[PDB]
Design a protein around this ligand. Structure first.
Ligand SMILES: CC(=O)SCCNC(=O)CCNC(=O)[C@H](O)C(C)(C)COP(=O)(O)OP(=O)(O)OC[C@H]1O[C@@H](n2cnc3c(N)ncnc32)[C@H](O)[C@@H]1OP(=O)(O)O
Ligand SMILES: CC(=O)SCCNC(=O)CCNC(=O)[C@H](O)C(C)(C)COP(=O)(O)OP(=O)(O)OC[C@H]1O[C@@H](n2cnc3c(N)ncnc32)[C@H](O)[C@@H]1OP(=O)(O)O
Ligand SMILES: CC(=O)SCCNC(=O)CCNC(=O)[C@H](O)C(C)(C)COP(=O)(O)OP(=O)(O)OC[C@H]1O[C@@H](n2cnc3c(N)ncnc32)[C@H](O)[C@@H]1OP(=O)(O)O
Ligand SMILES: CC(=O)SCCNC(=O)CCNC(=O)[C@H](O)C(C)(C)COP(=O)(O)OP(=O)(O)OC[C@H]1O[C@@H](n2cnc3c(N)ncnc32)[C@H](O)[C@@H]1OP(=O)(O)O
Lengths: 149, 150, 149, 152
């Protein structure tokens, strides 16, 4: 089966492999040092930014990642948890990994006293949304960005 | 123009809280009064990256607008970004440029803070607000998902 | 102040005017033959395609236009009415002409036994939706078109 | 291995099967139409003087019906030619992801080409990702919002 747990120093390699695949998916290309910057934050206990990794109990191969972080809110005393990134190996999909990755964050946020978790996806991403409508719900909102950003 | 924007002061509480209450009525929600103090506390604390500004009528120092924003991380960049959480202008003070000035103020401060990436989100039914947002920004092709029950 | 009514032969020039302004708004260009084709169909009683016009009761200034037609549906025995076009004079806006034009269709559709009226609009058209949200409700649906069309 | 499904217009003999799918389609949409409407729709499909049609997806092996697509012709003030609207589309649960859905939409495209009315369109529920997974391949999401009269 599959299990999810926070990344360790040893998981850096498999995480970067998924991080690259993830960038390909989005058709983007981040600076190579941003990888090192992010992992540094996941490991720094004083920075509320984490990363969990899905691993197969048999092969023990890292098959999925989920990067998330904590931030404030004017609408409540408790902070919110935002899942920034989610990615499961194209060959390890539909096995329940994405769901177990999101569920892990739910459980972790509950322990942090910040259960209110949210995230966003591109509207045309129906593959991901098949999973999203099962673990959450589409907010009737529109996102606006500053021109050029 | 007779409308200027500026960060809140301890003396701007009464005005900000009134708009905060009216903002709540607009959203059909109701927050505990203790949250109003916590929010204002974070605004005033220079070491907490949560700010608030007010659109002030220059004729009379009457506060007619409110905008609450805060800084937060991102896995897509080394530097953080700004999220405009709340925006509200008095009914009698609408369509005078206050809304756009409040958003520009955040834009300017974002620039000074070295975190120019500013964003926000409105209800898909709020066309009055979007009439402005479409001029000062652009609609991102994204869908927002929330954890069930939240 | 403002009254709505089905177009007549004498409303041709006043209708073609708003037609062209409506075309400018959408940034498109239809041939002049379509102006005559559509208007022909409006006047022809056999064709279930209509057009109403908002007029200033003071004078006889055509300030508004609304084109609509009847079409089938598999979801009911009763046909539906689709409001294809709607344009109010740029100087006569926020007077209630739009609301009146849509209300007129509702009443005419009811007398036809086809009360189900609907229309679509650009997602970015917040000016029109400020009105639509008052006389209608946004369906939680997404429209798709054939590639190229 | 290869499925091999054939798509064709309904005949009086297809009634029983089409209706079975029509009912499942309603269960999916969580609606309930009177049995009379099923008869009316089929009546219109079979009537050549009424521009409403229905095609059905059949297995090449056994002439078992596994898919359905209901569509019709209507006017438009934006062109001389009319256009086509795919009102319904359903494929049996156990016959999905085998190319049936796409073939049905493609059949409508061809018939639209033959009729002189190539402009085909449809709409789906915003939350219907299973379907849009296919629609994005055969069509494109228009930047439009659908509005209906209150109570309807
Ligand atoms: C980052 C942002 O948040 S948005 C971008 C997210 N990332 C991506 O899109 C990257 C590319 N995609 C992926 O990595 C993956 O497809 C993900 C992460 C979107 C999903 O990961 P997966 O490991 O496949 O998730 P999971 O295993 O839970 O998916 C299976 C679920 O989808 C359902 N599903 C899949 N296909 C279908 C279909 N055709 N019809 C109905 N349900 C379907 C499954 O039935 C299942 O639901 P269930 O677990 O109750 O049975
Ligand atoms: C993230 C957020 O919190 S979402 C919710 C924001 N808050 C609300 O919606 C609360 C209720 N509404 C409000 O408080 C206000 O309507 C706001 C803040 C949304 C806008 O504030 P305002 O002070 O009225 O903004 P502003 O004066 O810039 O609005 C006018 C703008 O809308 C344009 N506009 C076009 N048509 C119209 C119309 N029919 N009515 C109003 N404005 C219109 C104006 O032309 C103008 O652009 P411009 O200044 O370049 O000419
Ligand atoms: C299907 C169609 O083809 S989609 C395209 C329709 N056409 C266009 O978009 C063309 C360009 N626009 C126009 O010609 C017009 O603006 C139209 C047709 C969209 C609307 O026509 P109008 O004559 O202005 O409509 P109407 O007079 O009813 O508009 C006033 C309504 O808008 C509301 N409204 C306008 N600005 C605001 C604002 N800032 N805040 C709240 N409500 C507002 C008014 O309150 C009012 O509602 P009410 O009549 O109950 O008081
Ligand atoms: C207007 C309309 O009526 S709206 C409602 C349409 N009807 C419904 O939703 C009823 C319930 N659903 C159904 O009957 C079916 O699931 C339908 C009609 C939506 C689709 O019918 P199908 O016969 O399965 O379609 P089709 O065979 O083309 O589906 C396969 C396609 O989906 C894609 N797909 C399926 N599951 C996935 C997944 N998990 N990830 C990525 N792509 C996927 C396939 O890649 C494929 O594309 P391809 O053929 O180029 O390889």
């Amino acid at each position: 089966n599959i299990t999810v747990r926070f990344v360790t120093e040893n998981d850096k390699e498999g995480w970067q492999r998924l991080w690259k695949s993830y960038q390909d998916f989005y058709e983007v290309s981040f600076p190579d040092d941003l990888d090192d910057f992010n992992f540094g934050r996941f490991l720094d206990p004083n920075i509320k930014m984490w990363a969990a990794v899905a691993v197969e109990s048999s092969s023990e191969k890292i098959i999925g990642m989920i990067n998330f972080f904590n931030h404030m809110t004017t609408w409540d005393f408790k902070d919110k948890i935002y899942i920034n990134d989610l990615y499961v190996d194209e060959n390890s999909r539909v096995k329940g990994a994405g769901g177990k990755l999101i569920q892990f964050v739910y459980d972790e946020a509950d322990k942090l006293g910040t259960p209110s978790v949210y995230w966003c996806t591109d509207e045309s991403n129906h593959r991901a949304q098949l999973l999203y409508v099962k673990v959450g719900y589409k907010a009737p909102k529109i996102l606006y960005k500053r021109k050029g950003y």
